[PDB]
Design a protein around this nucleic acid. Structure first.
Lengths: 166, 70, 289, 180
DNA sequence: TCGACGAAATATAAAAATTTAAAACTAAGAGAAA
């Protein structure tokens, strides 16, 4: 992590090539998708930049429409554009912890956190960074397991990040 | 044998459910077998179940059969 | 400490996992993946009350399946009485609990390369296994093998390869490691005999096998017609609340079920003593406990 | 497309609101299986309307096996009449349906090995144990049993409109998973 | 000795409803050893 930080900040690229920089994605690799999983809403002063976890791609329609399983296929909750896709979710060596899945998982692994991004704008749901996982992956927390942590500093730093942002 | 099926027909025509009674009468069966035969006889013979319902033979066989081997 | 209690449990899990792996003959990285899945299981409030062999068997199976291998649940359950299907049920329960993603495929080509050495071996070990996987690759695309016990289809393909080639072996000796019933085995063999024209069976099967459509699975034949011959509109979808409202739940509605049921709800009291005689004869000690 | 699922099985329960014992009910019953050493609950079978509801000592009965929703509540009313006439008051209220099971055929063959790899988020495929694919749908919560034969078990919903919505939701999945 | 059928075992989704482990999780208790 440190070597990657000091190598990428040793920190730019070629302008106007980033539109063509998306390329052909083979079937099988896990694909990370943007905020509009099935709903697109006004995320809380958004700095998460892709906002959810990876999924597996099984089929492709065209060069700008890829099929990958997110929800049930009702009302076409299966395909999105390539502008909402990314590629890289790798190096478990650098990121030891897996992806927490259940609330009973979340209760026990709750006291291992890195950062808090922002509350989901729908009703109450928290979006957070966990520890020893890549920052691209994100983990969803609710208020049920949010009371068993040092969370005072978490919404404190979220408040001062909001102060910096707006 | 078909004679065992005839005897079971007579037993179900005599009284209601007697799974413990016929299980103890024949020391080689179980609850699953008599439940299975009740399930497969409730559907394939619509006239026989109604005939057993409207017949209700007196228990002149089970009481005597409970003493021959026990 | 909180971290101290984890170490003893993980050590016990490692000891049991290594004990089973010593008889399963699995590589090191498979056991490492199984142990990390066991750590994930403990992180998910590990299922209590289960037998220890069940959860370690499930973790070993999912680790051996995450990379394409050949091990079968019978090998997990091969200690003189294990009741393999209970292990399968525990694995099915842990599928949803552990939330398995990136599921592995089910292709029996790797099965033949491991079943070859025990039953129906070859001098070069190139002929029979390649013949079996070559016929299986095209029999898979005919939509015939779908959820039909991959060990069974592997054994059937091995038997078909032995039949088309020359190999003096006992037909019934394959059940030692395959563990497949003879009824479904001969069903799959004569299904292959039915779906193939047998044009060059004595020498070598057809080298250009293409069956585009034209065939159906046997279960489709059984229950597509749902009998024996020998995007709708939302208005067309009624709600079932009116069905529940049709029957009145009124307290005074106690006489709407008079269809000779009122004369025969319960047993008559004149035969109560007659029932009680055989009841105290047999069903007497059954209540004192 | 136009195929409608068939209403096949309904699971429902009611509470009679009395802390009774069931040995009294079992001692006076025309057709009722009961074993005190195992449980204190009595399984009773009636010819019509083909229901096998299970009564509990807590004062509640779970009605299962009814072909129709009318038949389920009518059988529950009959059992309420029985328990009124044997030894108890046991008022019949608070009807609630927990699960409705239906089966229907889609009439064209479905790819399932491709379906297992594609919809594996909501599917659980295990050919070593169960031939069918268990589709564990989340929203709405109906669990489907997809088969290559096209006969789909449709358990999970407590209503009929939910059943129809699940069928029309999963029909495009089988539409793209056709066999040519 | 190949074909012909019957039938329990599972999933399945609930509501339930008494007993049985049963394996993480604490907590003494000894034994080291600078």
């Amino acid at each position: 992590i440190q070597t990657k930080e000091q190598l990428e900040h040793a920190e730019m690229e070629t302008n106007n090539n980033q539109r063509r920089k998306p390329l052909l994605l083979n079937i099988g690799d896990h694909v990370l998708v943007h905020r509009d999983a099935y709903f697109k809403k006004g995320a809380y002063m958004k700095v998460q930049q892709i906002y959810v976890g990876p999924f597996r791609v099984v089929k492709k329609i065209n060069d700008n429409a890829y099929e990958l399983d997110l929800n049930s296929h009702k009302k076409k909750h299966r395909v999105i554009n390539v502008q909402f896709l990314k590629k890289f979710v790798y190096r478990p060596d650098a990121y030891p912890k897996n992806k927490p899945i259940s609330s009973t998982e979340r209760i026990k692994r709750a006291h291992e956190v890195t950062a808090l991004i922002g509350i989901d704008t729908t009703h109450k749901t928290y979006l957070c960074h966990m520890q020893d996982v890549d920052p691209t992956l994100s983990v969803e927390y609710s208020e049920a397991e949010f009371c068993q942590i040092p969370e005072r500093t978490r919404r404190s730093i979220l408040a001062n990040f909001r102060q910096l942002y707006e | 044998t078909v004679e065992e099926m005839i005897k079971f027909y007579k037993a179900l025509s005599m009284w209601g459910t007697d799974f413990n009674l016929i299980s103890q009468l024949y020391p080689y069966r179980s609850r699953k077998q008599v439940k299975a035969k009740f399930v497969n006889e409730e559907k394939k013979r619509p006239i026989l179940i109604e005939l057993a319902l409207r017949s209700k033979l007196p228990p002149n066989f089970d009481e005597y059969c409970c003493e021959i081997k026990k | 400490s909180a971290l101290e209690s984890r170490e003893a449990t993980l050590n016990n899990a490692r000891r049991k996992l290594r004990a089973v792996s010593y008889a399963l003959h699995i590589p090191e990285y498979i056991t490492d993946a199984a142990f990390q899945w066991y750590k994930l299981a403990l992180a998910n409030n590990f299922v209590q009350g289960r037998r220890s062999q069940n959860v370690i068997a499930s973790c070993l199976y999912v680790a051996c399946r995450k990379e394409k291998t050949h091990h079968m649940l019978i090998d997990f359950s091969s200690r003189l009485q294990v009741s393999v299907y209970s292990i399968g049920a525990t694995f099915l329960k842990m599928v949803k609990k552990l939330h398995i993603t990136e599921l592995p495929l089910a292709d029996p080509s790797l099965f033949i390369q491991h079943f070859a050495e025990k039953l129906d071996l070859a001098d070069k070990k190139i002929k029979v296994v390649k013949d079996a996987v070559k016929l299986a690759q095209r029999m898979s695309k005919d939509w015939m093998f779908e959820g039909r016990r991959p060990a069974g289809i592997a054994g059937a393909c091995i038997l078909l390869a032995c039949r088309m080639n020359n190999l003096r072996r006992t037909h019934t000796e394959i059940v030692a490691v395959s563990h497949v019933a003879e009824e479904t085995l001969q069903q799959r063999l004569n299904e292959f005999k039915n779906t193939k024209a047998a044009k060059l069976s004595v020498q070598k099967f057809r080298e250009n096998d293409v069956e585009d459509g034209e065939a159906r699975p046997p279960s489709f034949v059984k229950n597509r017609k749902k009998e024996r011959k020998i995007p709708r509109n939302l208005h067309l979808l009624p709600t079932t609340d009116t069905y529940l409202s049709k029957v009145s739940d009124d307290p005074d509605n106690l006489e709407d079920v008079d269809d000779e049921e009122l004369n025969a709800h319960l047993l008559n009291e004149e035969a109560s003593k007659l029932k009680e005689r055989i009841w105290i004869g047999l069903n007497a000690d059954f209540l004192l406990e | 497309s136009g195929i409608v699922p068939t209403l096949q099985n309904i699971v429902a329960t009611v509470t009679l609101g009395c802390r009774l014992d069931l040995k009294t009910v079992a001692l006076h019953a025309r057709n009722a299986e009961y074993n005190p050493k195992r449980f204190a609950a009595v399984i009773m079978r009636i010819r019509e309307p083909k229901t096998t509801a299970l009564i509990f000592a807590s004062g509640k009965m779970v009605v299962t096996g009814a072909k129709s929703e009318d038949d389920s509540k009518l059988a529950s009313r009959k059992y309420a009449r029985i328990i009124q006439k044997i030894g108890f008051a046991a008022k019949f209220t608070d009807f609630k349906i927990q699960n409705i099971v239906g089966s229907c055929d889609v009439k064209f063959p479905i790819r399932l090995e491709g379906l297992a790899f594609s919809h594996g988020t909501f599917s659980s495929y295990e050919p070593e144990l169960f031939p069918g694919l268990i589709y564990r749908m989340v929203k709405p919560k109906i669990v489907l049993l997809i088969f290559v034969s096209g006969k789909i078990v449709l358990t999970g919903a407590k209503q009929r409109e939910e059943i129809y919505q699940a069928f029309e939701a999963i029909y495009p999945v089988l539409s793209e998973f056709r066999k040519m």
